[PDB]
């Protein structure tokens, strides 16, 4: 169902944040992942609010990695 | 898309160039010398296949570097041979699973001497590989570079002779 796809979106978003904080991806790949995960959410019909929270956590992670 | 070396070291995906440290194990054959078989050195997977399928190709402009800069040869990519330096984009490999898969790449060098060889120090740059990711949800791509570094001291033969 939908919630299974929402759990997959959240897990992939969390893994992207975790990998970026660990330094195992660069910010350019994080932005690629963020864009691709938004496309996944839209094409799978996921609730906008979940896309918004996932995007907000990813944008904060990208901003921190930029700073450092 | 995420990858690791044979000793568990995570290969950073993107950013600047990533430095990948691998063991070179040269082999002399008629008219073609193996430099390094990356399929024993680099293992890749899709960490979140439920969300997106990763398609990865080797891009044109991939070539030897360092003390091997002026040499050409062949790259074996997923069971087919291609000129190296690459002049076209290779076919794609699909990552749709958390299963680690060997990266099906090996580099060969065309003999250009009778018995010569180049000394490779550990920490020497050997090759500069250009990769490209695409996916099944948008038309975007992501290009990134792997600097291949030698992890061992070894002689790379440039001719038809084993070095003892």
* Interface residue B31 vs chain A (CB under 8 A): no
Q: Tell me, what DSSP letter sits at residue B13?
A: B
* B117 found inside a domain: yes
Domain count across chain B: 1
* Interface residue B50 vs chain A (CB under 8 A): yes
Instruction: CATH number of the domain at B61, please.
Output: 2.60.40.1090
Please provide the DSSP assignment of chain A as one string: -HHHHHHHHHHHHHHHHHHHHHTSB-HHHHHHHHHHHHHHHHHHT--HHHHHHHHHHHHHHHHHHHH-
Contact yes or no for A36 and B138 at CB 8 A:
yes
* B161 found inside a domain: no
Q: How many angstroms is the resolution? A: 1.8
Q: Which residue has the tokens 């609010």?
A: A49
Phi, psi of A37 (to 5 degrees): -70, -30
* B164 found inside a domain: no
Other beta carbons less than 10 A from residue B8's beta carbon = 7
Experimental approach taken: X-ray
* B158 found inside a domain: no
Q: Are A61 and A23 in contact (CB under 8 A)?
A: no
* Interface residue B12 vs chain A (CB under 8 A): yes
Q: Tell me, what DSSP letter sits at residue B69?
A: T
Range(s) of the domain holding residue B41: 2-153
* B102 found inside a domain: yes
**Residue A26 burial by CB count (10 A; 0-12/13-18/19+): exposed, middle or buried?**
buried
* B87 found inside a domain: yes
* B63 found inside a domain: yes
Using an 8 Å CB-CB cutoff, list chain B residues near A35.
138, 140
Q: Which uninterrupted H or E stretch holds B155? A: strand B154-157
């Amino acid at each position: 169902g939908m919630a299974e796809k929402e759990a997959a979106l959240t897990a992939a978003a969390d893994g992207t944040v975790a990998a970026l904080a660990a330094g195992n991806i660069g910010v350019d790949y994080a932005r690629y992942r963020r864009k691709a995960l938004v496309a996944y959410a839209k094409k799978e019909g996921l609730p906008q609010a979940v896309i918004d929270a996932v995007t907000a956590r990813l944008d904060a992670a990208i901003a921190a990695a930029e700073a450092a | 898309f995420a990858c690791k070396t044979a000793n568990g070291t995570a290969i950073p995906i993107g950013g600047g160039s990533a430095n990948v440290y691998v063991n070179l194990a040269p082999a002399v054959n008629v008219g073609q010398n193996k430099v390094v078989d990356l399929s024993t050195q680099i293992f890749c997977h899709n960490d979140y296949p439920e969300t997106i399928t990763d398609y990865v190709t080797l891009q044109r402009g991939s070539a030897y570097g360092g003390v091997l800069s002026s040499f050409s040869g062949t790259v074996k990519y997923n069971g087919s041979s291609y000129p190296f330096p690459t002049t076209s984009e290779t076919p794609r490999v699909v990552y749709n699973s958390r299963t680690d898969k060997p990266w099906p790449v090996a580099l060969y060098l065309t003999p250009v001497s009778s018995a010569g060889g180049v000394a490779i120090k550990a920490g020497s740059l050997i090759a500069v590989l250009i990769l490209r990711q695409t996916n099944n949800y948008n038309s975007d791509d992501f290009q990134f570079v792997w600097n291949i570094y030698a992890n061992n001291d070894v002689v790379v033969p440039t001719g038809g002779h084993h070095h003892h």
